[PDB]
Structure formats: structure tokens, C-alpha cells
């Protein structure tokens, strides 16, 4: 329903195009957030609409590659879904047209070699405010230019003493325009062409050149690339190229308590406030997996946070499209997180195994659940005394343990500090609401219980990455849970009965399994 598929219809009909190319240009540099889930939802997402193609472009332009990012971000992209038409494209591929066709613009008097020093070309450029000004070096003859270019690319140069500019207009109202460099010298071995090259194409140029030669129909960048667009449009005109992509902007994802920055993330994983990139709190790909987030949820996010307004998406949109998912496809299970001793005195004999479904709404069939005369409860959900709200076991009253029998609230013993050690009760000759699980038949398990990152709906236009975090984003606590949560493969969620989704944890097992909690209920 957005302007760009509507945009895209136009230029189906009436020509301007016959299929669909895009591509998605992430960085080498770090790792998929949730941000880079609306470029990579957009850029794929249409391409399989019409039928047409996506193309994945690493930028290893710059001669530390760090094998890892690459592998993890393609990684990232097909869990979500989708598929990148032929290889994996590299921007190092190109040097040798984006190299040729820079010579072209020289040989037009539109580009020229600039031995001003950087310091110089930065003060030369001017402000919004002040014009900029002309090199000494500016107009220069088409075969100066043209040799000083070879010296360049010879290594003739020394750093920083030389570099080719567009020539353009310094008086331009956007700054991108006043002679961007297009050239510049590192005497450094690359690493896919280590000493073959010399000098390097700046992004800009480098960026509209591949999407041409890559048959990119329509180029989709965030809004702060909307500048760049006329430098991008400026050399594509003037170059002698088939195709030409146009841009067209989406805006940058702004998710509430959450930062989508480098220098904002780069701290936390670098001060142990997350387990790293991966940890539930953050707002990568890979954190959200290893919380329990799901491919499909992620995408179906994708579809309210785009299909304007005061468009700062909050939690909860992202929380209910997992929660909702969840709620459907994840069986149901019992566990204690604040387990305290419950024990009825009445209970004859030593156990059984009560009927438990696998999902109220059961295709899912069952499963057998102990139920012994030693219990373990939440001690939230027991109290001496209480209003007429509470829904619990109160002292002289009870409740219905789930798919079990009805209790009774009688004795309870304490301690030396206050806190209590032990209920006592008793139950029903026969009744086959509140979650519990047998003593004797359960798993000692940790729960790691998280939260929202920041105590600010924006921790970004907040004054520091620091200072705004929520102290306690997580608290481990150890819980007893059924035997059932002894198969539970990794990733799988499950409902823990009125507590919310869990999923075992990747990272921390066998004798031991840790439970990190996605979302609660909607209740």
C-alpha cells in the first residue's frame, strides 16, 4: 500500500521498467539489528511480490574484513526468509569499471585531480551558511587531469598529497555537491586485491556505480541518504551506463526503548551490560532469536511498522506480534519461579499422573504430569489474608491447582527471619486456579526473567547511552518446573502457565536447562 510498490506499479505499465531488481547493502563492519529488518523486509519483501529479484552487496571496499559478519548476516537474512538473487556480491568487484569510468568523467572536464590537502579541501568546501570555494587546481586541462590520475593510481603520490573530485558546484545547497572526492591514496594491501590497487573510490561513487552494473531497478536507502541521491543521479546521468536506478528513501526504524546506534550498542556489549550481541536485551537479530522471537513474527512486525504519522513504534507492537505468535503454536507446561512448600497432610498414597493438555484450543494431544502429595507453588500465590480480589489460596479458603484437585489452606510454618519455609493444606477426595508442580518428579531450572533495556521510551535522543538503563533489564532466578521441560528442543517456546513464553537458552542445558522468558501474557 506504500508509495514506492505504487511507484513501482507506474513504472510496470507504462514501461519504465519490466521486472523488479533491488538489493540490500548492510556493512561488513557489525552485526543485523532490528532496524535493518525494515531495509531487508522492503528490499526483499518487494522483490518476491513481482516476481523479481534481490541482490545482497557487501561493502569490503575499505583494504579487515573480519570473516564472520559476512557468513552472519547471511545467516540472519535467510532465517528471516528471504533469499538474495546469484552470488553474494562484493563492491571490491567493481574497481575496475568504477576506476574506468572515472577517467570518462575527466575526459568530459568533469572530474579532476586536487593536490589541496584535506585540511584545506574541509575549509575550501564552505558551510549551509558559508559558499565554498574553487581549488587553485580546479580547472584544470582534461590531460593534466588525466596524467596526474596515472601517477596516482602508479603510486607516484604520496598520501593525502593528491585525490580526484567531481567537479560540480561549490555554491550547491547540499554540501554532498561541492567537489565530493571520488579518489583517494592508501598505500595498504586490500585483501581481495591486496597491492594490486593504490588508490580507492569513495562510498558515494562506488554505491550508484554497482547498483548500475548490477541492473538495480529501484534503489531503496533510509532517509539520510536522501542528499546523496543528487551526487548519485549526477554521475549516473553522466556516465555512459545502461540502466539507472533511481533511490528512493524509507524512514530509519525508531523503536522505543531501544537505541539503533553503533556507538550507543558498541558500549553495552562493551561493559558486560549484555552478554554480548546475542543477549535477549539487545536489539540485534541474533539477540532476539536466542529470546524467542520468531522468523515470522519478526516479518509480520515488518508489516505494522510500514504499511505517516508519529511513526516511534513502541514495545508493545513488537511484543504483541511474538506474544500473539507465540500464543498459538507454543504448547503449553508448568513451572515455579518463586517455589515455596506446599504439602498436604491428607494426600493418601505416593503418586500418579494427572491428564495435561499440549494447547487449550487438542489436535496437540497430551501428556502425563506427576502429581504427588509434595508440591511446589509460587509463593506469590498463597497469603494469610487478602481482600475480596485476590484470586488465590487465602489461609481458610483454596483454589484449583490446574488439571489437578481442589486444595485447602490450613497450617503454615516459618523461620527464624519471617519468610515462609513450608504451607500445609489439604485437597479433595476427587475434583478431576493455579500453576504448581510435584516435589519429588521436577526440574531444578533457572529462569532468567528480562525486561525493557532502558527506563526511557528514548534512550536515543536521551542524553547518555549510560545513565538510562534499567538496572535490573534481568534477574536469574532458580525454579522448579515439570519433567515435561526435559525434552523441549533448543529455540522452542513453550506458555508456562500464567507466567508468560519461555525458551530454553542457547548459550547456558542437560542436567540443567536455563528458560529465558520472551514475553508475558496480554492479561
Known amino acids: 500500500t506504500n508509495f514506492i510498490r505504487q511507484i513501482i506499479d507506474e513504472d510496470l505499465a ?37 516476481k523479481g529479484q534481490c541482490n545482497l552487496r557487501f561493502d569490503d571496499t575499505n583494504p579487515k574484513e573480519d570473516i564472520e559478519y559476512v557468513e552472519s548476516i547471511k545467516n540472519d537474512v535467510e532465517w528471516l526468509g528471504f533469499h538474495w538473487s546469484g552470488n553474494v556480491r562484493y563492491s571490491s568487484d567493481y574497481f575496475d569499471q568504477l576506476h574506468a569510468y572515472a577517467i570518462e568523467l575527466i575526459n568530459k572536464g568533469l572530474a579532476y585531480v586536487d593536490e589541496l590537502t584535506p585540511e584545506q579541501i574541509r575549509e575550501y568546501r564552505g558551510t549551509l551558511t558559508q559558499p565554498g570555494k574553487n581549488s587553485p587546481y580546479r580547472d584544470r586541462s582534461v590531460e593534466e587531469n588525466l596524467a596526474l590520475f596515472e601517477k596516482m593510481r602508479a603510486g607516484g603520490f604520496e598520501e593525502g598529497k593528491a585525490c580526484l573530485r567531481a567537479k560540480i558546484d561549490m555554491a550547491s545547497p547540499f554540501i554532498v555537491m561541492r567537489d565530493p572526492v571520488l579518489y583517494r591514496i592508501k598505500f595498504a594491501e586490500h585483501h581481495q586485491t591486496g597491492n594490486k590497487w ?10 550508484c556505480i554497482s547498483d548500475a552494473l548490477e541492473g538495480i531497478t529501484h534503489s531503496l536507502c533510509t532517509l539520510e541518504f536522501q542528499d546523496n541521491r543528487r551526487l548519485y543521479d549526477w554521475v549516473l546521468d553522466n556516465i555512459t551506463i545502461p ?6 528513501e524509507f524512514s530509519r526504524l525508531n523503536l522505543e526503548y531501544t537505541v539503533m546506534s553503533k556507538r550507543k550498542l558498541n558500549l553495552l556489549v562493551t561493559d558486560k551490560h549484555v552478554e554480548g550481541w546475542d543477549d535477549p536485551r539487545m536489539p540485534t537479530i541474533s539477540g532476539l532469536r536466542r529470546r524467542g522471537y520468531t522468523a515470522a513474527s519478526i516479518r509480520e512486525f515488518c508489516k505494522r511498522i510500514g504499511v505517516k504519522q508519529d511513526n516511534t513504534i513502541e514495545m508493545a507492537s513488537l511484543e504483541s506480534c511474538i506474544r500473539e505468535d507465540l500464543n498459538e503454536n507454543a504448547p503449553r507446561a508448568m513451572a515455579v519461579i518463586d517455589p515455596v512448600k506446599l504439602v498436604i497432610e491428607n494426600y493418601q498414597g505416593e503418586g500418579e499422573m494427572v491428564t495435561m493438555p499440549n494447547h487449550p484450543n487438542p489436535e496437540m494431544g497430551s501428556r502425563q504430569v506427576p502429581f504427588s502429595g509434595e508440591i511446589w507453588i509460587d509463593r506469590a500465590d498463597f497469603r494469610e489474608e487478602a481482600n475480596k480480589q485476590y484470586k488465590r489460596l487465602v489461609l481458610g479458603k483454596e483454589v484449583r491447582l490446574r488439571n489437578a484437585y481442589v486444595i485447602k489452606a490450613e497450617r503454615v510454618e516459618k523461620d527464624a527471619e519471617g519468610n515462609i519455609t513450608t504451607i500445609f493444606c489439604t485437597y479433595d477426595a476427587d475434583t478431576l486456579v493455579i500453576h504448581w508442580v510435584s516435589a519429588a518428579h521436577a526440574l531444578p531450572v533457572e529462569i532468567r526473567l528480562y525486561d525493557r533495556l532502558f527506563s526511557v521510551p528514548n534512550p536515543g535522543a536521551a542524553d547518555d547511552f549510560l545513565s538510562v538503563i534499567n538496572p535490573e533489564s534481568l534477574v536469574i532466578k532458580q525454579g522448579f518446573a515439570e519433567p515435561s521441560l526435559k525434552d523441549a528442543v533448543a529455540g522452542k517456546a513453550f506458555q508456562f502457565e500464567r507466567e508468560g513464553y519461555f525458551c530454553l537458552d542457547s548459550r547456558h542445558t542437560a542436567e540443567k536447562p536455563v528458560f529465558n522468558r520472551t514475553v508475558g501474557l496480554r492479561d
Open 14 to 50: 507504462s514501461g519504465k521498467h519490466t521486472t523488479v531488481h533491488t538489493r540490500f547493502p548492510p556493512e561488513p563492519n557489525g552485526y543485523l539489528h532490528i532496524g535493518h529488518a525494515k531495509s531487508i523486509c522492503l528490499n526483499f519483501g518487494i522483490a518476491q511480490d513481482y
Open 198 to 207: 593504490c588508490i580507492y573510490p569513495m562510498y558515494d561513487f562506488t554505491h
Open 243 to 248: 540502466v539507472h536506478p533511481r533511490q528512493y
